[PDB]
Design an enzyme around this catalytic site. Structure first.
Site, short mmCIF file in Angstrom:
data_model
loop_
_atom_site.label_atom_id
_atom_site.label_comp_id
_atom_site.label_asym_id
_atom_site.label_seq_id
_atom_site.Cartn_x
_atom_site.Cartn_y
_atom_site.Cartn_z
N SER A 1 0.82 -1.21 0.00
CA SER A 1 0.00 0.00 0.00
C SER A 1 0.86 1.28 0.00
O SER A 1 1.64 1.42 -0.94
CB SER A 1 -1.00 -0.06 1.14
OG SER A 1 -2.00 0.90 0.87
N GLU B 1 -9.46 -4.55 -3.04
CA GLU B 1 -8.68 -3.40 -2.57
C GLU B 1 -9.52 -2.31 -1.92
O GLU B 1 -9.11 -1.72 -0.93
CB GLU B 1 -7.90 -2.77 -3.75
CG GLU B 1 -6.81 -3.64 -4.33
CD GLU B 1 -5.58 -3.84 -3.46
OE1 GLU B 1 -5.48 -3.23 -2.37
OE2 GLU B 1 -4.71 -4.63 -3.88
N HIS C 1 -7.44 -5.04 1.52
CA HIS C 1 -6.04 -4.67 1.37
C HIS C 1 -5.24 -5.00 2.61
O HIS C 1 -5.72 -4.80 3.72
CB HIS C 1 -5.85 -3.21 0.90
CG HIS C 1 -5.87 -2.19 1.99
ND1 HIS C 1 -4.76 -1.38 2.23
CD2 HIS C 1 -6.86 -1.86 2.86
CE1 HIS C 1 -5.11 -0.60 3.25
NE2 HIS C 1 -6.36 -0.86 3.67
N1 LIG Z 1 -5.27 3.48 4.66
N2 LIG Z 1 -5.03 3.37 5.95
N3 LIG Z 1 -5.47 2.41 6.61
C1 LIG Z 1 -5.18 2.39 8.03
C2 LIG Z 1 -6.02 1.29 8.64
N4 LIG Z 1 -5.23 0.09 8.82
C3 LIG Z 1 -5.21 -0.86 7.85
C4 LIG Z 1 -3.98 -1.11 7.05
C5 LIG Z 1 -4.04 -2.15 5.98
N5 LIG Z 1 -5.18 -2.88 5.79
C6 LIG Z 1 -6.33 -2.71 6.48
C7 LIG Z 1 -7.42 -3.54 6.22
C8 LIG Z 1 -8.58 -3.44 6.99
C9 LIG Z 1 -8.65 -2.53 8.05
C10 LIG Z 1 -7.60 -1.65 8.33
C11 LIG Z 1 -6.42 -1.71 7.57
C12 LIG Z 1 -2.83 -2.44 5.09
C13 LIG Z 1 -1.73 -1.37 5.25
C14 LIG Z 1 -1.49 -1.10 6.73
C15 LIG Z 1 -2.69 -0.34 7.31
#
Ligand SMILES: [N-]=[N+]=NCCNc1c2c(nc3ccccc13)CCCC2
Ligand SMILES: *[C@@H]1O[C@H](CO[C@@H]2O[C@@H](C)[C@@H](O)[C@@H](O)[C@@H]2O)[C@@H](O[C@@H]2O[C@H](CO)[C@@H](O)[C@H](O)[C@H]2NC(C)=O)[C@H](O)[C@H]1NC(C)=O
Ligand SMILES: [N-]=[N+]=NCCNc1c2c(nc3ccccc13)CCCC2
Ligand SMILES: *[C@@H]1O[C@H](CO)[C@@H](O)[C@H](O)[C@H]1NC(C)=O
Ligand SMILES: *[C@@H]1O[C@H](CO)[C@@H](O)[C@H](O)[C@H]1NC(C)=O
Ligand SMILES: *[C@@H]1O[C@H](CO)[C@@H](O)[C@H](O)[C@H]1NC(C)=O
Ligand SMILES: [Cl-]
EC number: 3.1.1.7
Lengths: 536, 538
Positions: free
Chosen positions: B203, B329, B442
């Site tokens: 990401s 995504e 994601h």
């Molecule tokens: N954009 N931002 N998102 C912050 C919330 N935390 C999550 C992250 C990721 N996936 C998520 C999936 C679901 C809920 C929060 C997520 C992947 C990258 C690391 C951060």
């Protein structure tokens, strides 16, 4: 000794028809019946006047003259083009109609089918072999009528607001023939209370204009629109555009400033002088665009067909609408560089971009880019076969498939009973190349039942297929439903609705029900592209 | 020293370190956690580029994770694993510039390829200390040397007043670069090969990897790159200098710092860290999702031009890249800010909710651009079907922000000489607590690539354990050779390179590799070719 079956009295007087041979038996044909005063001399560009009564027995045994028109020279000697060319002498004295009925004449009133030919409002004749009503008369017991109507400048040149050239006179010729049917068809055993209009291409656009013009609505009960609609980008012009085209044509022939003088000078011109410049008045280089077509006059058409199909009440109407598999393929050989009937027409990306400009001539640079991006196969963007087929699809979708989907939707939402189809069978005898697939008009010979004639060399499958189509069309004419009250083995043809969007495939296989007529692509043409034009 | 494990004592440029022997399922690993790579970016150093850590005396204890960079914490769902697994797991502090090293135990005898992890979290969150970024499985099973660094996020890492000396922008990317320079100089001491360094990120971490590909001073610090669900190009990863200036100025007003850049920045430096975090979301120009306030800026320095211009004109002949996306995504982003969406219901939405969602999901879209999106994503056979509208909304967000920028990047890189391998990850973890409608959100591939299913206590299925091992092999074979395929295993289906001609990518799921063509080709022509022209003209 005269045959009493061949003797008929109509309001204008006595007629003598001819006993014709159809494969299953005889039919009565009354050919070349005058329905109007010859629209010659001072009557050129004027509405038709009803034919005055005649003395004695009028000979109605042969087809009459074809309305003065441009004759295709694109491929001399070739059946593919020549089957559409005039097959009788060209004349401005052309307002005649034809009647085919069973032999002997029907005992009880029989549903009437009225054919309106196509040919881009610049050509056509009711006398073509593919419009032969003898098979429908003999096999289905139908009363078939077809009329000649004025085409090109003669039928559609307009100076809107003028008394001398009001426009839409070719549509008024059609209307006069419909009025003639109301008044005289009972004499042939036809039912004036059961009249179905059917037409193809400009003939289908004409049928749609009778649906949208109130004085025509009392003259028929049901309608068939094959590969054509009143709405869409080619079937009509605004009053301003008709005026510009007529003024330019007059300038081109040395005429003459008031409308009276301009029109009077145009009336002195030989018919061929008008035809020689008719193709020179189009605003851009284009295909599927015709110089002299119906005009939004505020009279025959009270508003644009788009506005009339959106606000109209169609509760009392049954409509059969459809398309062929390759609507646009003919139009490509006529004016898109890289296209030919004599080669596979494999084109480059550059030729596709240039073709889109010719095929969508009203499109701005951004609209043309949107078309190219939608029709490109992004997995094979430079593949010449894909580009050739995408070019054909652009033309067919823009001009026919998506205006048909638009019309079917509006009619169904506003109370009409609608049946839709896609015709996918390519005639075994077709002389156009295989890449052209099923071109516009190559369903007609099957609906009219020409494969039933053993001398025409169609396959056994084609003869059975033609019999099935004749039944759908005549069951529709009789009941407003193409379904047979008998054959439970074949699936039922469901009405087209805005909710289910059901249509059927017409081919050698039994009917198949499909949903959504190019739904995604027609949302592009019908919903997105207008917005792209309205804001630019 | 004297009685300590002699295998855990290492010297680096700054001095001596003592690591810890960790247990991985197959055996021990060495971990050197919380190594300082920069001077604490505190006080007068806030918003400034990182300075290298000055040497220390004695043996620095590198046995525990250090502080997490100051950031917003998600408290929306108390006790919910779905959000809490991404939340900080150590103390929040501006003193956060530390890195972590995992190596086999005993340390490799010969130089080993290095993998460097850059976490995501929209440039406003994340930590190298999260359980899903645990390097012990890759170190133990694959013999990898794994490095992960903390880098400044939010205002601390990305607030910029372009042209100023005090807040030049992109300092979080400079933290990442400093950690890459630290690896070049010191990784040989851990048995790592500085001549075989692979960056991988997910990401905003993948967008960061892309920015190192596009920034010349970073190019000499790595040889290969993995971009998971993120790109430097696209609508969220960068802002113009003008937009960064507007956002910093507004944030400063919101915290009591009024109007000269020096004075504004000096006043911002007096503010408590939590005051900046409390106002950072208030500076976005429109109501939106998948948009972050403080991100990399096109400064004309770290980024000499926009990533779009740099990916179109760049020469990538010397580069091997692995790129890909997860199946869904956009699904997380919908529950965060689109009305009608919830993790606690099926989120079946109306047509009106879909049109309103498109305005939030494509916040830069004009009325005409938003209607083009709605018309493209509507199923005209079922235009009012709530399940299709819900799925189309998720597809709009996912395609616009990730899938189509990835396809754009893969195409440009391949046309300009790079070796590209592309994938779609379609496996939903059996352990996933987000609802089924969200599919594979994601970041839910990360735990498989890091090999967490190898730990029997985490309750993944046997199939998931075998699947994790296969992924660890693709990623480490890519790090070692620039090719994810195993040369001594021609029986297993081959992963072909992505090319502009064939557009081949693979599906990563429980089934053997399957080759597919065109990464959402028709839809991405809409986003990548048509939509820019709709903006450029109107
Ligand atoms: N954009 N931002 N998102 C912050 C919330 N935390 C999550 C992250 C990721 N996936 C998520 C999936 C679901 C809920 C929060 C997520 C992947 C990258 C690391 C951060
Ligand atoms: C799904 O839930 C959302 C959110 O509602 C909240 O969470 C639920 C689980 C429940 O606890 C509710 O009481 C909560 O309010 C619903 O979305 C709202 O819908 C209304 C009306 O359509 C709209 O005005 C709000 O803006 C929406 N709010 C949010 C935060 O999205 C949605 O209606 C529920 N969907 C279904 C299918 O039940
Ligand atoms: N437009 N115009 N077309 C005139 C060219 N002639 C043809 C016609 C039709 N189909 C054709 C198919 C191929 C070639 C010419 C054709 C159907 C309606 C009658 C006219
Ligand atoms: C097909 O014929 C036309 C004839 O003018 C020509 O222009 C075109 O290039 C030909 N195409 C091919 C593929 O040969
Ligand atoms: C049918 O085929 C025969 C040759 O077997 C040919 O003589 C005849 O003219 C063909 N008919 C038509 C209408 O082309
Ligand atoms: C694993 O499963 C056990 C039950 O067998 C359960 O008590 C435990 O909480 C689970 N742990 C995880 C990490 O899911
Ligand atoms: Cl036009």
């Amino acid at each position: 000794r005269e045959d009493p079956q061949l003797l008929v009295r109509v309001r204008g007087g006595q007629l003598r028809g001819i006993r014709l041979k159809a494969p299953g038996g005889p039919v009565s044909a009354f050919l070349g019946i005058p329905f109007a005063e010859p629209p010659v001399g001072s009557r050129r560009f004027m509405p038709p006047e009803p034919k005055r009564p005649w003395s004695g027995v009028l000979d109605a045994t042969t087809f009459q003259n074809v309305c003065y028109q441009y004759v295709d020279t694109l491929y001399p000697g070739f059946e593919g083009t020549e089957m559409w060319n005039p097959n009788r002498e060209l004349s401005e004295d052309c307002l005649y109609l034809n009647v085919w009925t069973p032999y002997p004449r029907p005992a009880s009133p029989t549903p009437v089918l009225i054919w309106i030919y196509g040919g881009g409002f610049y050509s056509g004749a009711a006398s073509l072999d593919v419009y032969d009503g003898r098979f429908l008369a003999q096999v289905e017991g139908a009363v078939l009528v077809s009329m000649n109507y004025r085409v090109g400048t003669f039928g559609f040149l307009a100076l809107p607001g003028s008394r001398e050239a009001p426009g839409n006179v070719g549509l008024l010729d059609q209307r006069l023939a419909l009025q003639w049917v109301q008044e005289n068809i009972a004499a042939f055993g036809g039912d004036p209370m059961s009249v179905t209009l059917f037409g193809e291409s400009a003939g289908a656009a004409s049928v749609g204009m009778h649906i949208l013009s109130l004085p025509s609505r009392s003259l028929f009960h049901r309608a068939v629109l094959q590969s054509g609609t009143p709405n869409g980008p080619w079937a009509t012009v605004s009053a301003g555009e008709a005026r510009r085209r007529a003024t330019l044509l007059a300038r081109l022939v040395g005429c003459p400033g008031n409308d009276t003088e301009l029109i009077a000078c145009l009336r002195t011109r030989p018919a061929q002088d008008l035809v020689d410049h008719e193709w020179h008045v189009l605003p851009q280089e284009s295909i599927f665009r015709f110089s002299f077509v119906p005009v939004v006059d505020g009279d025959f058409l009270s508003d644009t067909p788009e506005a009339l199909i959106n606000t109209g009440d169609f509760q009392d109407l049954q409509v059969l609408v459809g398309v062929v598999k390759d609507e646009g393929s003919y139009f490509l050989v006529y004016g898109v560089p890289g296209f030919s009937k004599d080669n596979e027409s494999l084109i480059s990306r550059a030729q596709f971009l240039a073709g889109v400009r010719i095929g969508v001539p009203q499109a701005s640079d951004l609209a043309a880019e949107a078309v190219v991006l939608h029709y490109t196969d992004w997995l094979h963007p430079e593949d010449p076969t894909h580009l050739r087929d995408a070019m054909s699809a652009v033309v067919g979708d823009h001009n026919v498939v998506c205006p048909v989907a638009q019309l079917a939707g509006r009619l169904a939402a506003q109370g009409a009973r609608v049946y839709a189809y896609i015709f996918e069978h390519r005639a075994s005898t077709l002389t156009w190349p295989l890449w052209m697939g099923v071109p516009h008009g190559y369903e007609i010979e099957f609906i009219f039942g020409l494969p039933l004639d053993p001398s025409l060399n169609y396959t056994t499958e084609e003869r059975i297929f033609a019999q099935r189509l004749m039944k759908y069309w005549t069951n529709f004419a009789r009941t407003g439903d193409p379904n047979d009250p008998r054959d439970s083995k074949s699936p039922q043809w469901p009405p087209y609705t805005t909710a289910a969007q059901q249509y059927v495939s017409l081919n050698l296989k039994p009917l198949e029900v499909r949903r959504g007529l190019r739904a995604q692509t027609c949302a592009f043409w019908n919903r997105f592209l207008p917005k792209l034009l309205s804001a630019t």
